[PDB]
Every structure is written in structure tokens, then in C-alpha cells.
Amino acid sequence: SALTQPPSASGSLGQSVTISCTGTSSDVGGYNYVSWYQQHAGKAPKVIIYEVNKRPSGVPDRFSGSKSGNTASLTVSGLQAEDEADYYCSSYEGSDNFVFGTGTKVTVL
Ligand SMILES: CN(C)c1ccc2nc3ccc(N(C)C)cc3[s+]c2c1
Structure with a gap:
């Protein structure tokens, strides 16, 4: 049981x-x-977004979320070097449970 994300x-x-x-x-x-x-590898995970498209304080305006049907998305706009990292989603799944995505490695061209 794991949410589907592109590998990279x-x-x-x-x-x-x-x-x-x-x-x-x-x-x-x-x-x-x-x-x-x-x-970033070997660093603690940052919370970028919760509840589809809510940012904790401190997350820049260039991070946004969308959802339609059974697919949610995160866009990192205005890409910076600083943004190269693995990105994971999770969702509530009922019954007091969560499910996580497989993660996406983001790189800058
Ligand atoms: C019983 N235990 C400790 C917990 C732990 C975390 C939880 N998180 C939720 C988050 C969202 C939500 N929604 C219905 C969206 C339902 C729940 S129920 C829930 C139960």
C-alpha cells in the first residue's frame, strides 16, 4: 500500500x-x-504542504498544491538549486490510518 509518484x-x-x-x-x-x-538525504524532512494546499509559515509562495479526482500534485515553481530533494506525499486513508507515496527525486537541469 503506497501512493503513486514519478520516481524522478x-x-x-x-x-x-x-x-x-x-x-x-x-x-x-x-x-x-x-x-x-x-x-535532502540524511536531513530531516520539511513539511511543505498539508491539507492539499495549506503551507506552514515559512514555506515560500512558489510551493503550491492542486487536486482533482484521485490525484493530488505539488508544484515547485521558480525552481532553485535549494529545491533539489526527494518529495513525498501522504494521505489520510480512513480508520485512523495514513498512506505514503513512494517519493520523487527532483533535480535541476
Ligand atoms: C487514533 N489516532 C491516534 C489518530 C491519529 C491521527 C489521526 N489523523 C486523522 C487525520 C485526518 C482525519 N480526517 C478525517 C481527514 C482523521 C484522522 S483520525 C486520526 C487518528
Whole structure:
């Protein structure tokens, strides 16, 4: 049980990268409860987004979320070197449970 994400994605500096997160009607599509995490290897994960498109304070305006049907997405716009990292989604899935995505390695061209 794991949400589907592309293994990797790339973009040029200044451009954008979009990470999808696909589940089912009982998780991604059933709730507004998608989170996104950014992790550099061997560093703690950052919370980028919760509840599809809510930013904790401190996350720049260039990070946004969208959802339609059973797919949520994170876009990192205005790409910076700083943004190269693995990105993970998760969703509530009912029954007090969460499910996580497989992660996407983002690189800059
Ligand atoms: C019983 N235990 C400790 C917990 C732990 C975390 C939880 N998180 C949720 C988050 C979202 C939500 N929604 C219905 C969207 C439902 C829940 S229930 C829930 C139960």
C-alpha cells in the first residue's frame, strides 16, 4: 500500500516541476488531507504542504498544491538549486490510518 509518484522529475532553474500523488477514492480522492514533505538525504524532512494546499509559515509562495479526482500534485515553481530533494506525499486513508507515496527525486537541469 503506497501512493503513486514519478520516481524522478527535473526542471531548469526558474522553471517549475510538478509531482503527482495518485491514490484511490478512499484516500487521496476521499479527503482533503494530502501532505507533502521535502527531504535532502540524511536531513530531516520539511513539511511543505498539508491539507492539499495549506503551507506552514515559512514555506515560500512558489510551493503550491492542486487536486482533482484521485490525484493530488505539488508544484515547485521558480525552481532553485535549494529545491533539489526527494518529495513525498501522504494521505489520510480512513480508520485512523495514513498512506505514503513512494517519493520523487527532483533535480535541476
Ligand atoms: C487514533 N489516532 C491516534 C489518530 C491519529 C491521527 C489521526 N489523523 C486523522 C487525520 C485526518 C482525519 N480526517 C478525517 C481527514 C482523521 C484522522 S483520525 C486520526 C487518528
